[PDB]
Subunit: 499 residues, 4 copies
């Protein structure tokens, strides 16, 4: 016998006991008599528009594909839940953290980034780790990566970035000249660049990796007090990466490696877990931080801000229909229930917009009306109506303007966004030179040993080599700024690759 | 106080009862602490992106509109049932006729023909009478209208017709030349044109008008024997038209008069009803018939073809939410249960294609998933997946290829099309001159009496007059062919009309 | 020979006289043999899916309809130009007012608000007066209204407003209970509501109504020197409006009266024009202003803030294709070139989001490329790419990331937005009580004379009379808050109406 | 210096030199001041809605993606011309062949099949070969392949087939159980399934393979006589296939091998070319012939039906912008100028619908209006109007109904379709027994030599080595039904793989 994976269609007909098979039908529910031989005038004559069975199917077939994620197209998914094992109600008053043992059902999706839908899992790229919490207050999406930091700190340079990583407008090939001209001119990436070309670059599956909310957020307690926080949900399966070697063999032996490793893990019953933590920084402590507490290209050293365990993330159910439940999902950072709010983290401020923006496009206006995306542990109610493909509903014949004198939905002041005071002019404030080295240096010669320190200078040079020379220096320079040796090793290697 | 319609909100609230309102949430179900004031820095400062409340809402509002139906955009809808007051199971074996007494939930939408969503019901124009049956063998969309005949005999000239019947491409106004130039160049229109300007051109409210299927159809029984039939449903509310002045008045006082009439009649228990009948014709007779039995412009005389009583059509329910229940109601002439097949009606043949084609574009590739359209009385199982906005499970893990050896949906030798045998060179046979007078001449003389004739012409003469002298000639010319007098009688009015 | 609008097809045939007709082709360009009779196997047989002429033409016919603008569905559009005639450059460095005699192409559209596409023109309703300028610095849209004020003062209570106006979620009929229940609950509307029900609520055609910017905008000259402002452009054709009697008649007689009137004028050289002035309030003034200077329901009295002439708006070019030129026409208040900026007017701010947004839905992601919408007088060059229905050269090989060292477009540091200082807490400041009457009273008492006040209350009562009693009560109350006479004069009429 | 594909940007800057870079603007052409730092309230403050530079850019990015082709997603495309070399004026009256030395602009896209957009070029999968001839009679899309046969002879099966190749509905991974199950239960595949695993399964470069109109078509001369034919465009650069290990190496070393390879050729003057031939068969012969002369899994033998020469296919132009020219490219078999006509193929006929149809989905209603799809060597003129993103002018003010009396587009009898007399009942004729083994055996034996013969079994087994035995068996039952040793060798291999 094979693995639970391949034995899919197998484990399907079985459980289907001896119950006869459903009756093939058209979308209209008309029982199809013969769906193998099209209607034709004569055995060698043309086809009639009359074969609606055919028309009905081909028509549906011609419209399956929808736009793939603008980023993170390739990924895996599965559901499970979250459970409380610590009390942090002092910090946030969210319903998901209510009492201890408070298990909220979740939905998570792993994925790559730069590659398309046909791409393989096993390759150097950050990883998409987004959780969908279904809470009585509504849904809460923690759209996070496998790291607490990203490459850029101003949303505006993101589209340009994603481009710099994806194909060339003309050749449609991957273009290093682009990948590095951008990185080179934007040293802020330094930090997250180094993390990428580290060993973590390619985990073993989606399980032996770490999850983070990356950004800085804001918790609020039932007492109206607030404090900035950072979420870290480590892996209980342990950290594990794949040598550039395997990453390549796997790249072709099983392009969907990480994909079926997650399905079998849960099929065989070995459910992947993660222990959720959170750092904590008061506003007072925020004004003090030697750095921008809201800079996405920075971290809060654990020593100065220790981790507090909060919960256990347990994925235990495997998706049935992938399209409907995984590809069709929708993780929107904007979705945050009372007790949780965004920080003025310029990058975070960008996700507040983009996700619902695209979602409406990828899936359509009512993209939340999709089962997987619908917040069922809540009771959506308001003054919104219509839209294409309006399922449900449509919120019945209830009044549609606010305010109204007809007992239609009223607001709840208990969920008012926490009020903070901000002073200063309205201007395009430059964050470019917000120190893109320090924390980086203490990562090259403080977080990594000599072994991986080198594996880095090797990985990087192996790619940089392909970029125009003038580019290489503009890069070596920056790296150097993190530490001379850093740029020395790399540069060296390059020249050897440079013939 | 006033009418039930206008009392919509009232009642809704009284039913709502003492039940406290629902917490006003965002699309994501998150409660809103205050959906009346925006998040602005300062009481007179800028608006913030961070106001995902505003953006959430506003956004759905920006997508509230879907393209109105290409034709018959304005209308009203109601649900109810259908009863089997007779056993017509000798001709058609459709389960919707199974046994006397059986009932099948129906859905109907009345509509005008040309005017967009904002026009007025009380205007001369044919009328849409769609009857959707939710059977146990899929659905059945009998797209009827108040008239058994139409204007054209071949689809190809349909998109062209509707055009002439709408706004000039440059001015955007109703064009008399666009209208009459077309009607004059296509005599086959001579029939319905007459019926159109007659007293039936404006039926007083929906309840007071008949419904027809026009297209010759096919009824297959148990033995597989087949026949051609027509579908007529006479109104139990008796016929009632609206004088030009009484309608032309209601055009403003109440442009949605028809919509209100219906809702109101129902809301007051007074349900509109229709008896169903059909006309049966043998391939042999259809052979002998003096005309083309599938010529939409002609009718099967009562005498030669009496109407057999079928069952009843009760409208005892009003829509809850209009946009989700009526606006989206989609009727595809293709939905025919095993037992009702189309006919070689060149006109019908076209529709077979169009409805789903457009429904796939107005509502979406998965429109058959909309609650109203879904055949909730049968089990839809087939090999079609994905498509934007996939509701339900999408046949979960069930296979997707046919045939297959995994106990997936099967065939239905019983639901096989009937086998008719045609012959002749496959080409484009000009149907332009298949007697465009006979029946028109029988209408203008034996069906109408002098006062009814008088009207017809004045009605016609008053509209045709705005066309160019030349079209007027061409127009009158065709009328004389039906009958000398018809022509001159109208002509007369024109010369006067030309003051 | 009638009005130029009627003879549209005439002058066409005429226009291309000696020039022989072009060949009829499918979408693909292939020539069409016989476009009248579909390809049916046998003169009375089915329709071959092999017939492409049909399918091609039919499938397209099936997708002709796109959503109609969310609000202001029914309108009229013409193209003309703008000519500067006064140096106001000391207030805005906008390249549009650049210098005396300056000519900038414009495109305007007139509209109603609540009615859908079939809706009648001559009805009480504000009027849209959206201009589009194709300035050398990019398109500058100034979306004017036939009134310099609006009902609500916060963008959040807007979707609700429109809802109250349009059809009821259930019956689908206009609901006066809905309308007035709303206005009654938000007295800020008094001002505009009063204007609306005044003779000005039903202008005789588009040629007799002033256009306004309503919102306060911020102008910025060459020395980054700012100044708030109001946009006014009075008709040069004289203020004229249809009585309540002519309006109803026309309502059914000529639903497209505005269209017809506007088309004809131009068509016959009788070009309409508007002079554009602007009031100038300095930051120091907007400070001590007796009201919030960014409150859409208020106006800067001519007395303390004059009107400085700018130039003229002239329309002299009818649309050739309505759909392609007047329909797909989309204006974004967000489009403002260097020198013309927004104010903190909350009501305005929202608009910065919604117009481009909704457009991305109605017209489509790449709608900015639709001819009538492209800033043809400017040269786009950005890192934007792809999306459906992408024309032009998608900037071709051009680099796609920013910054880049490959000579792609750069940022002009001279068009950097002006910078203002705002301080305070950031939150939901409740601006529902910023005086909802003062100005209203001035309008009722000093702007209108008895003759007028008489029609107004009559008019208000005409509609309101139908709102449930408790609603009418609440309504008269407010009016009284403007003036005892106001509420009373109506009340009487009310009690009068109730038998 | 490196290859052309690598030096893409390098050249852009080079040639685009001696020119000040363009001004980076917005969608509306407004110059941006700084596109690197979003607008906020103070250095550490929230992002303002005011920032439109941001939104515009972001939203537009949030939509860059459109759905990929349901099949043949991964591909490379280029442009060239077709040159007549021989006179087959007698077989076709088609203008594209008018004379000797007649050039016609063509566009081409090569593509794998069951692989998603991100997949890798080199993999056992048929190659998509589609040429778009822009002729004076519009565009004639010759939607071919690198093989002259397919896996099934009935459209209906296609969706079911295609799904079998793609991913598993639940585990989303590629699944052999599905693969082989389909083929096992469907023997017609045999012929094409053999060719696949043959040495031709993985062609080296897109230039070292052939082209096969595949289907059977019809030809019509000026005198009206018709006949059937087979299209063949043999590679001039010669056939060069890739090994199995090599293929799987570039598979991850360079997954975009096709693109690069092909792009570089044309980039250096090494323009590839193909010779277009035609096999001819007269109706008479179409009668004598011995299995269905249209069976898509049957090829005419050069022996009895020889290869006639026609012309040259030369591709000497690379796309400037890929998304604009290749991604948006749309080839519709339904496009066919006079002289070329479909044939009964129960497979082809269906294609005539899937292509234009699925396009109205993937790209949009007016997709034929996208620059590369437009039939620019002709002149579209008809009665089709509107639809979203209506580019051009919608045809201006021309009359929109046919017929008309205003000199609008007329028709050409010259373009009438050939009339074939088809006799025989109208029903679903089984095609499962049309011989799916005779021709096949001839391959394995004749066309194939002992050497390659081995690499087939080895390959056909290397894959099937993952399908439940019960499946493996069924398969061997056919291969052997082809020829004893075929399944023999296979079965011998399979056993070892079964460890
Ligand atoms: C922030 C609140 C606003 C939002 C979200 C908003 C939204 C809309 C929407 C959805 C339409 C439909 C347009 C169409 O279908 O053609 C519209 C039309 C219009 N808006 Fe309002 N708008 C806002 C504020 C205003 C203000 C502040 C003005 C003052 C120019 C204005 C002027 C117009 C005009 C002129 C039209 C009609 C355009 C035409 O048909 O030519 N809007 N607006």
């Amino acid at each position: 016998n094979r693995d639970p994976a391949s034995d899919q269609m197998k484990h399907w007909k079985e459980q289907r006991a001896a119950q006869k098979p459903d009756v093939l039908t058209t979308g209209g529910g008309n029982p199809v008599g013969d769906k193998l031989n099209s209607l034709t005038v004569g055995p060698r004559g043309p086809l009639l528009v009359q074969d609606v069975v055919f028309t009905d199917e081909m028509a549906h077939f011609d419209r399956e594909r929808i736009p793939e994620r603008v980023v993170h197209a390739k990924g895996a998914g599965a559901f499970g839940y979250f459970e409380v094992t610590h009390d942090i109600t002092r910090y946030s008053k969210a319903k998901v953290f209510e009492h201890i043992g408070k298990r909220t059902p979740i939905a998570v999706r792993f994925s790559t980034v730069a590659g398309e839908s046909g791409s393989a899992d096993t390759v150097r790229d950050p990883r998409g780790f987004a959780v969908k919490f279904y809470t009585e207050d509504g849904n809460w999406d923690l759209v996070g990566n496998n790291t607490p930091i990203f490459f850029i700190r101003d949303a505006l340079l993101f589209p340009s970035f994603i481009h710099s990583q994806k194909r060339n407008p003309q050749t449609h090939l991957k273009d290093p000249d682009m990948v590095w001209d951008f990185w080179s001119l934007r040293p802020e990436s330094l930090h997250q660049v180094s993390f990428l070309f580290s060993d973590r670059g390619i985990p073993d599956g989606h399980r032996h990796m770490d999850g983070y909310g990356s950004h800085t957020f804001k918790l609020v307690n039932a007492d109206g007090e607030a404090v900035y926080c950072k979420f870290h949900y480590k892996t209980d399966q342990g950290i594990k990466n794949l040598s550039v070697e395997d990453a390549a063999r796997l790249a072709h032996e099983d392009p969907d490696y990480g994909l079926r490793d997650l399905f079998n893990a849960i099929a065989t019953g070995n459910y992947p877990s993660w222990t959720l933590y959170i750092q904590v920084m008061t506003f007072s402590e925020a004004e003090i931080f030697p750095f921008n507490p809201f800079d996405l290209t920075k971290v809060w050293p654990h020593g100065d801000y220790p981790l507090i365990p909060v919960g256990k993330l347990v994925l235990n159910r495997n998706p049935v229909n992938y399209f409907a439940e995984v590809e069709q999902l929708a993780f929107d950072p904007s979705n945050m229930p009372p007790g949780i709010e965004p920080s003025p983290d310029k990058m975070l401020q960008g996700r507040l917009f983009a996700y619902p923006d695209t979602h409406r496009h990828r899936l359509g206006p009512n993209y939340l009306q999709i089962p997987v995306n619908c917040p069922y542990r809540a009771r959506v109610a308001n003054y919104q109506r219509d839209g294409p493909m309006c399922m449900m509903d449509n919120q019945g014949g209830a009044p549609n303007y606010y305010p109204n004198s007809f007992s239609a939905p009223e607001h709840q002041p208990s969920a008012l966004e926490h009020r903070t005071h901000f002073s200063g002019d309205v201007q395009r404030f430059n964050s470019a030179n917000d120190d893109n080295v320090t924390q980086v240096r203490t990562f090259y010669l403080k977080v990594l040993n000599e072994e991986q320190r080198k594996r880095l200078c090797e990985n990087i040079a192996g790619h940089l080599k392909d970029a125009q020379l003038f580019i290489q220096k503009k890069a070596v320079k920056n790296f150097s700024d993190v530490h001379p040796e850093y740029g020395s090793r790399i540069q060296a290697l390059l020249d050897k690759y440079n013939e």
